[PDB]
Homo-oligomer: A and B are copies of this chain.
Amino acid sequence: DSIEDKNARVIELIAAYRNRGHLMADIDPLRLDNTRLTLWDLDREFKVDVQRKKLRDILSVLRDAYCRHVGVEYTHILEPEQQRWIQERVETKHDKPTVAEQKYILSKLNAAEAFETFLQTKYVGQKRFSLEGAETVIPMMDAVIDQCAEHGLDEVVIAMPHRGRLNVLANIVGKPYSQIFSEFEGNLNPSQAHGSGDVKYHLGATGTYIQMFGDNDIEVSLTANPSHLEAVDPVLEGLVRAKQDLLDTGEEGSDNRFSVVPLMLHGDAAFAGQGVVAETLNLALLRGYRTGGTIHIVVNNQIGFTTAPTDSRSSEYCTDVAKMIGAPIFHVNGDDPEACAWVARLAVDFRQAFKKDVVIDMLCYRRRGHNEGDDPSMTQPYMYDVIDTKRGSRKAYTEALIGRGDISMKEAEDALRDYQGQLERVFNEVRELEIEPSESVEADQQILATAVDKAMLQRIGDAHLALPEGFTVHPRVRPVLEKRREMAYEGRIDWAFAELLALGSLIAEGKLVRLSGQDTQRGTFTQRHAVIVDRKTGEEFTPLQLLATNPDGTPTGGKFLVYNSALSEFAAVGFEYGYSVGNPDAMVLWEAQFGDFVNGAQSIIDEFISSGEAKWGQLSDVVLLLPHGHEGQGPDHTSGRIERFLQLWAEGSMTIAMPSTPANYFHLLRRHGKDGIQRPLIVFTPKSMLRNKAAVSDIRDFTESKFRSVLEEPMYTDGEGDRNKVTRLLLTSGKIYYELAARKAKENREDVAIVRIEQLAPLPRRRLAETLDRYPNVKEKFWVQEEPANQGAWPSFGLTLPEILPDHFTGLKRISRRAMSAPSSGSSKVHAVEQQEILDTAFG
């Protein structure tokens, strides 16, 4: 009504465009959804933040920035400087691309569409999950990578699903067309045939991107992945984080460049529905997981196979999950490749300025069916009636560039004729060039002293008392530090100290050690104390970090990276798997709170850890620490599901162990870090046995011994025990050994021997046969276990042991809990009665 009233209505209007203008922006190239102050005041001047501008001018700047082909979501960001940064770059006149840059974009759209159309012609009946209707993804990714090269970064690491995967591999990464054509030909040379393999749209590649108009180059990698959509997200993060740590960039680096950029592509239905997306975004700013911001690209073809977005998500945008970490979101029209390239460059600039994630929602469509053989009009007839009227983005942009006067019709035709002639000469060459069953990858990696000097044990012990000046140790943490120095010099080394002796000795030898998991710094069972907290100030101290410096003051090259993970299994296990792939020379350990929670990461275990080598030739040396054992804490605090990992095992893909002594655990970890084999290690670790006074080791077991896959009772190897008196053999693994040994001693049963299987997979066949041959008077052999009959090692051992060793194990019987639906009973009293029945049966 007044001057103060009008100037106030304008400020609300400005805010309305900045907050909700994205809901009006012309972002959908299909235009499916139909429902998507006075006139004298437009020429009046108003106060804007400090200059005076006309309302018409304020309105035109706002409609240009927020209501054209780019929908900007940023007012949810809590940091005001990030809101100002976006506002300043979005609310200004944008410099038009040069004719050369426009021609370059069209060349990318040409190769994108001509690649898809060549495959439709040659291999009409072969699934390729085409990028048709989304070809702008190619110039957009090219702009992301080019912008990264402009900032002088070292590498872009890509992870993506099926949508236009082959197109990306050929036109962004640089994977030869001959290789991609040999895969459709179904004829692979012995190197491409090796292992069991995977489908062509799961494969990765590496290359060097060279700037078209710049002088920089950048490494471009694409990681392998399963069909399981979004499963590769935390794997990419881990991979990038390991590479950043090697380059001394990022979080654990001297420079704050985060010079390895994660570029993560997603489908619209997969991005909204999969939980691992939220779990992975939740890591984006964590000290132990951040990679300085990921560039996310959502290929939003407004469809997920036959499912409409209305049935796929409960939110406006498929990208709304990214608001949880305050990521800016750019919804961009896939038919405007210049707006797509510009947004991609802005996204990289934002990542570089704030070391935070950025989401690009590319609104497009899927020209053909879900796969190339599918008819989408059965379920989406309206959408496909609209798509059938739509001229592709390539034709649209070509007609735009001719009208502008940039290129001629002849120049456009010739450019496509050249590219079509090139694909045909490559296809002919491969076509011009016997299928056998897949072979096991076991022999692919074959290959050891793990003992350390007394001085090394003493150094790791002393490190626990080499406290900074003034440091106030918690009075209940102080005895751990003092008892460890004593253990290092006097023996009776417990499990938790043996672990740190192995990690510390590896650090001292120059190895990078990464250890993480839930409450892993202290230890779930208050046993580790890898990090100690000053009682008065809260300052942290990591005793093992002192081992990264030689006594002369020089660095060993080693480092101790220990973290408390977020409350995740899927993303945390994915990340550590990725980290180990990213740095094969690192010692990477992930610890479950209890092994019962690793089933939250079942997709990682099944799709990456146990099978990644056979499927993609991708090697990982990740260690999974799974606290395991029947102690009466209930069905979710008892089992690490040994039977599942043993079932998954084949082709020597993993090592699976359940060590019974601290020294054997020490040697197992050192063998794993020093063997030069990149294969995952699954370890079933103790809980109560951490504080079992019988479960301790002598210094000579660390300094003069090695890993023992099979263990005999000390009375026959280092004592006065007679192996010829033994009539009954009890074969076992884990903590049940001490309970059986205590019963044998109590009853003086010289007729019974207890043999421990420390390495569950691969089965130590020769070692087991050699050990059993030392007991010639054995009349009966029993596999004894705590676990229910359908769980533990019995389901695999009961079947494999009589087969691999018939002369030793024909007639092998089982002593265990009954078969159970849950891993144990809920009552500790019921556990106690069942545990005593096992001991009574074994000695009956």
Q: Give the chain B neighbours of A15 by CB distance below 8 A.
A: 12, 15
A463-507 vs B, CB cutoff 8 Å, 1 = contact: the mask equals 000000000001011000000000000000000000000000000
> Are B636 and A820 interface neighbours, CB within 8 A?
no
Q: What are 29 A-B pairs at a CB distance below 8 A?
A: A19-B75, A186-B828, A186-B829, A188-B827, A196-B635, A196-B824, A196-B825, A198-B635, A198-B826, A269-B567, A272-B567, A273-B567, A274-B600, A287-B310, A290-B314, A304-B567, A311-B564, A312-B566, A315-B325, A324-B324, A377-B535, A378-B533, A379-B521, A437-B834, A438-B820, A438-B830, A613-B821, A615-B821, A648-B790
> Are B474 and A307 interface neighbours, CB within 8 A?
no
Partner of A822, one of B12, B614, B828, B837: B614
Partner of A821, one of B6, B602, B611: B611
A31-51 vs B, CB cutoff 8 Å, 1 = contact: the mask equals 000000000000000010000
> Are A634 and B198 interface neighbours, CB within 8 A?
yes
Decide yes or no whether A610 CB sits under 8 A from chain B: yes
> Are A535 and B278 interface neighbours, CB within 8 A?
no
Give min CB distance, A289 to chain B, whole Å: 8
Decide yes or no whether A313 CB sits under 8 A from chain B: yes
Interface pick from A89-97, A245-253, A794-802? A794-802
Give min CB distance, A244 to chain B, whole Å: 17
Decide yes or no whether A694 CB sits under 8 A from chain B: no
> Are A820 and B281 interface neighbours, CB within 8 A?
no
Interface pick from A132-140, A213-221, A390-398, A649-657? A649-657
Chain B residue at minimum C-beta to C-beta distance from A633: B199
Q: Give the chain B neighbours of A278 by CB distance below 8 A.
A: 275, 277-279, 321
A591-611 vs B, CB cutoff 8 Å, 1 = contact: the mask equals 000101101101100110011
Q: Give the chain B neighbours of A826 by CB distance below 8 A.
A: 196-199, 202, 615
> Are A649 and B790 interface neighbours, CB within 8 A?
yes
> Are B7 and A5 interface neighbours, CB within 8 A?
yes
Chain B residue at minimum C-beta to C-beta distance from A473: B378
> Are B274 and A311 interface neighbours, CB within 8 A?
no
A242-275 vs B, CB cutoff 8 Å, 1 = contact: the mask equals 0000000000000000000000000001101111
Chain B residue at minimum C-beta to C-beta distance from A832: B435
> Are A651 and B819 interface neighbours, CB within 8 A?
yes
> Are B818 and A440 interface neighbours, CB within 8 A?
yes
User: Which residues of chain A from 8 to 35 have any CB-CB distance to chain B below 8 Å in the complex?
Assistant: 8, 10-12, 15, 19-20, 23
A354-397 vs B, CB cutoff 8 Å, 1 = contact: the mask equals 00000000000000000000110111111000000000000000
Chain B residue at minimum C-beta to C-beta distance from A73: B76
Q: Give the chain B neighbours of A320 by CB distance below 8 A.
A: 323-325
Chain B residue at minimum C-beta to C-beta distance from A790: B650
Decide yes or no whether A284 CB sits under 8 A from chain B: yes
Q: Kindly list 17 other residue pairs between chains A and B, CB separation below 8 angstroms, not including A435-B829, A435-B830, A606-B641.
A: A188-B827, A199-B634, A227-B636, A228-B600, A270-B567, A278-B279, A282-B314, A304-B567, A305-B524, A306-B564, A378-B477, A381-B536, A437-B825, A602-B602, A650-B821, A651-B820, A795-B795
Q: Give the chain B neighbours of A594 by CB distance below 8 A.
A: 227
Decide yes or no whether A413 CB sits under 8 A from chain B: no
Give min CB distance, A496 to chain B, whole Å: 14
Bound CA span A246–B506, Å: 62
Bound CA span A540–B269, Å: 22
Partner of A197, one of B382, B568, B641, B830: B830
Partner of A273, one of B197, B282, B538: B282
Decide yes or no whether A745 CB sits under 8 A from chain B: no
> Are A438 and B795 interface neighbours, CB within 8 A?
no
Copy tally for this chain in the complex stands at 2
Bound CA span A633–B193, Å: 16
> Are A5 and B566 interface neighbours, CB within 8 A?
no
User: Which residues of chain A from 69 to 120 have any CB-CB distance to chain B below 8 Å in the complex?
Assistant: 75-76, 78
Chain B residue at minimum C-beta to C-beta distance from A375: B476
Q: Give the chain B neighbours of A441 by CB distance below 8 A.
A: 821
> Are B597 and A228 interface neighbours, CB within 8 A?
yes
> Are B324 and A567 interface neighbours, CB within 8 A?
no
Give min CB distance, A619 to chain B, whole Å: 13
Q: Give the chain B neighbours of A226 by CB distance below 8 A.
A: 635-636
> Are A306 and B198 interface neighbours, CB within 8 A?
no
When A566-B272, A833-B436 are in contact, do A790 and B647 touch as well, CB less than 8 Å?
yes
> Are B653 and A538 interface neighbours, CB within 8 A?
no
Q: Quick one: which of A324, A435, A594 has the most chain B CB within 10 A?
A: A324
Q: Give the chain B neighbours of A285 by CB distance below 8 A.
A: 314-315
Decide yes or no whether A563 CB sits under 8 A from chain B: yes
A637-653 vs B, CB cutoff 8 Å, 1 = contact: the mask equals 10001011001111101
Give min CB distance, A52 to chain B, whole Å: 11
> Are B599 and A305 interface neighbours, CB within 8 A?
no
Bound CA span A435–B308, Å: 56
Decide yes or no whether A288 CB sits under 8 A from chain B: yes
Partner of A275, one of B440, B568, B641, B830: B568
Bound CA span A198–B78, Å: 43
> Are A571 and B275 interface neighbours, CB within 8 A?
yes
Partner of A519, one of B290, B306, B653, B788: B306
Partner of A518, one of B307, B323, B563: B307
Give min CB distance, A684 to chain B, whole Å: 17
Give min CB distance, A477 to chain B, whole Å: 6
> Are B570 and A275 interface neighbours, CB within 8 A?
yes
Bound CA span A819–B644, Å: 15
> Are A821 and B196 interface neighbours, CB within 8 A?
yes
Q: Give the chain B neighbours of A568 by CB distance below 8 A.
A: 273-275
Decide yes or no whether A526 CB sits under 8 A from chain B: yes
Bound CA span A321–B568, Å: 15
Chain B residue at minimum C-beta to C-beta distance from A532: B378
> Are B819 and A8 interface neighbours, CB within 8 A?
no
Q: Give the chain B neighbours of A55 by CB distance below 8 A.
A: none
> Are B637 and A227 interface neighbours, CB within 8 A?
yes
Decide yes or no whether A769 CB sits under 8 A from chain B: no
Bound CA span A11–B635, Å: 58
Bound CA span A361–B369, Å: 44
Decide yes or no whether A4 CB sits under 8 A from chain B: yes
Give min CB distance, A225 to chain B, whole Å: 10
Q: Give the chain B neighbours of A10 by CB distance below 8 A.
A: 8
